[PDB]
Nucleic acid binder design. Structure first.
Ligand SMILES: [K+]
Ligand SMILES: [K+]
Ligand SMILES: [K+]
Ligand SMILES: [K+]
Ligand SMILES: [K+]
Ligand SMILES: [K+]
Ligand SMILES: [K+]
Ligand SMILES: [K+]
Ligand SMILES: [K+]
Ligand SMILES: [Mg+2]
Ligand SMILES: [Mg+2]
Ligand SMILES: [Mg+2]
Ligand SMILES: [Mg+2]
Ligand SMILES: [Mg+2]
Ligand SMILES: [Mg+2]
Lengths: 111, 154, 165, 135
RNA sequence: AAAACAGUGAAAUUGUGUGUGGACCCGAAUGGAUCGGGCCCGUCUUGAAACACGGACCAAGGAGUGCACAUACACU
């Protein structure tokens, strides 16, 4: 079963993170950008080393497309969180989900 | 000619339709609703029990303030009724299709009521006199009817 | 002039549109990507993407812009000769002393794949040759044979950029 | 039909994917059936759309107008001209680089055949080519 | 008072079948739970979502016009 293999392949090679919010103020949301936390990264200086890296959301139960790709654009706040952009806008139903950080840089056009 | 409201083959089916009948619209569709998808001999047996007050017609759409009854439990509801005048008409109509089936060379068994529909016919006007010198309406609401039964493939 | 053209056609001088088309094309042209410097012949690398991810392999050459050429060891880990984008490789500080005679080419390892190649494995003379070169450098060395067999696993308890390779 | 203007062939998809799909429905046309969807400007003293409160819909205006070069261009990269005679195509003979023809609906079968034969020899694109004449 | 063609046959409204939702609109999406913003219009009024008035629903009809007399502007 290909899904079980594709997971183990990704698990061995990537860092792990979770999606927790869109970019927002107290009143309005900006769904083009999403906010991520990475496992053991806990300062803004530590987080700067990931700016530019590729990210992937893998979803095996999906009928349309099994994974969405994206890129980390900027650091956010003072405790090591980041801001990222994806080829499609993330649904509110997909918040709380697991994200993979891929250890190589890509250009803003590739996504 | 008549354009029946759906498309089923002439072979392996039997049909009837009537216009402007003088049975009451809302009562008739509650009757038709419950005998849909039923086998024809079962339908005729059930309607005989309704005439004898041994079983009832359950009500779902035209049902406000209706009485509760132990006979309604057979269809998972509390509310039911005994509309004798509509039942006598539908029963006659179904019995005639068994004559047509036999004469056409299908079996008298394995026939299932695949389609049945009721429509409103134009109103017949009437009047009642009220107090303070007023006159108010007192109209009648007739109906149109279609049925198609088919032979089970089994 | 006929009445259809004296009215409808009048909206735009369309003879100008070529100039617009050029400017638009320019703007949506892709940005350039840099060819890296850090990799030397016979560097061991770890594969990060596609069907062969997690295995150690040996880098041979630049090929076609960002494309690079690598070999597994069909005896040791079963991976043959392939091509990949040079960014999908993690560098490590081990360098073998291999030198090759000529240029060779192979199938690309795309990032998106549908199915695993469990069967249907064969070798060319050049695959044989290159293995029978690489193997000599490996046989003489203590645990190197086993090193190529275990997949790589990232440490789940510390930040990646703290580690050295 | 799958045809494209050769001067825009490598650009047409950028153009098409860039067009807006916004609609400007009349206010409260969703509430009562007697008000049609066609735009009318609200003029009430209290009206929330005229006063531009956040959460009300947007109103039409000049800011939304497309660039002068892209405007009026069909998805195949041509502009259109209406025709009803053989003698109409004769006008397009200088313009066939950017314009294409669309035969009017009321022209009947026997006449359409004569239009299409002329279009082939002059080298003019007709977009209703199949039309009624499929049978 | 109503009532033309034994033409065409819209909308309100009803039944049956198939799909999608629990008042609905705008912005953004998922294989899938939804997220953010929005009080009912018209009108008099310092001030209306109002415990101010008119509005059950659909079609068709429905309100700055003509002449005379001086006048300022544009055009011949
Ligand atoms: K109803
Ligand atoms: K549009
Ligand atoms: K006001
Ligand atoms: K604009
Ligand atoms: K008529
Ligand atoms: K008629
Ligand atoms: K008022
Ligand atoms: K009040
Ligand atoms: K008043
Ligand atoms: Mg009662
Ligand atoms: Mg009385
Ligand atoms: Mg009296
Ligand atoms: Mg007051
Ligand atoms: Mg009232
Ligand atoms: Mg009107």
């Amino acid at each position: 079963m290909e899904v079980i293999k594709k997971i183990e392949l990704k698990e061995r090679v990537c860092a792990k993170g979770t999606l927790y919010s869109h970019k927002r103020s107290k009143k309005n949301i900006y769904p083009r950008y999403s906010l991520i936390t990475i496992e053991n990264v806990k300062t803004r200086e530590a987080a700067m080393k990931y700016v530019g890296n590729a990210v992937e959301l893998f979803k095996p139960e999906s009928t349309k497309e099994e994974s969405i790709h994206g890129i980390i654009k900027a650091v956010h706040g003072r405790s090591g969180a980041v801001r990222a952009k994806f080829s499609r806008n993330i649904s509110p139903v997909e918040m709380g989900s697991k994200v993979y950080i891929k250890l190589y840089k890509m250009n803003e056009d590739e996504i | 000619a008549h354009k029946y409201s759906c498309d089923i083959s002439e072979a392996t089916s039997v049909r009837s339709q009537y216009n402007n009948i003088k049975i009451k619209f809302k009562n008739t569709r509650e009757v038709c609703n419950i005998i849909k998808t039923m086998e024809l001999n079962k339908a005729i047996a059930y309607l005989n029990d309704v005439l004898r007050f041994k079983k009832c017609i359950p009500v779902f759409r035209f049902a406000k303030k209706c009485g509760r009854t132990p006979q309604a439990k057979e269809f998972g509801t509390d509310k039911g009724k005994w509309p004798v005048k509509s039942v006598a008409f539908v029963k006659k109509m179904l019995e005639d299709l068994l004559v047509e089936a036999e004469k056409k060379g299908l079996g008298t068994s394995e026939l299932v009521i695949k389609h049945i529909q009721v429509n409103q016919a134009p109103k017949i006007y009437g009047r009642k006199h009220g107090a303070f010198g007023r006159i108010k309406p007192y109209n009648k609401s007739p109906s149109h009817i279609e049925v198609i039964a088919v032979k089970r493939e089994h | 002039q006929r009445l259809n053209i004296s009215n409808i056609k009048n909206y735009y001088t369309a003879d100008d549109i070529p100039a617009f088309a050029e400017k638009l094309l320019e703007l949506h042209k892709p940005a350039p990507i840099e060819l890296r410097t850090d990799l030397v012949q016979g560097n061991v690398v770890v594969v990060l993407e596609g069907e062969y991810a997690s295995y150690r392999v040996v880098y041979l050459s630049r090929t076609e812009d960002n494309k690079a050429l690598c070999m597994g060891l069909p005896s040791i880990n079963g991976i043959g000769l392939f091509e990949i984008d040079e960014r999908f490789l993690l560098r490590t500080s081990i360098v073998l002393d291999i030198r090759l005679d000529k240029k060779y080419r192979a199938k690309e390892s795309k990032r998106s794949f549908k199915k695993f190649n469990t069967k249907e494995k064969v070798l060319t003379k050049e695959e044989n040759d290159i293995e029978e070169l690489l193997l000599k450098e490996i046989e003489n060395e203590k645990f190197m044979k086993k090193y190529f067999e275990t997949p790589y696993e990232i440490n789940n308890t510390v930040d990646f950029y703290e580690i050295n390779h | 039909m799958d045809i494209v203007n050769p001067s825009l062939s490598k650009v047409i998809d950028i153009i098409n994917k860039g067009k807006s799909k916004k609609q400007f429905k009349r206010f409260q046309s969703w509430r009562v059936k007697r008000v049609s969807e066609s735009w009318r400007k609200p003029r009430g003293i209290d009206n929330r759309m005229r006063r531009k409160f956040g959460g009300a819909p947007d109103m039409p205006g000049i800011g939304y107008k497309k660039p002068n070069a892209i405007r009026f261009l069909l998805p195949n990269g041509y502009r259109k001209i209406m025709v009803a005679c053989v003698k109409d195509l004769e006008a397009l003979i200088s313009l066939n680089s950017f314009y294409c023809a669309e035969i009017r609906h009321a022209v009947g079968s026997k006449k359409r055949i004569e239009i299409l034969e002329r279009a082939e020899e002059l080298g003019i694109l007709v977009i209703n080519k199949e039309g009624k004449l499929v049978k």
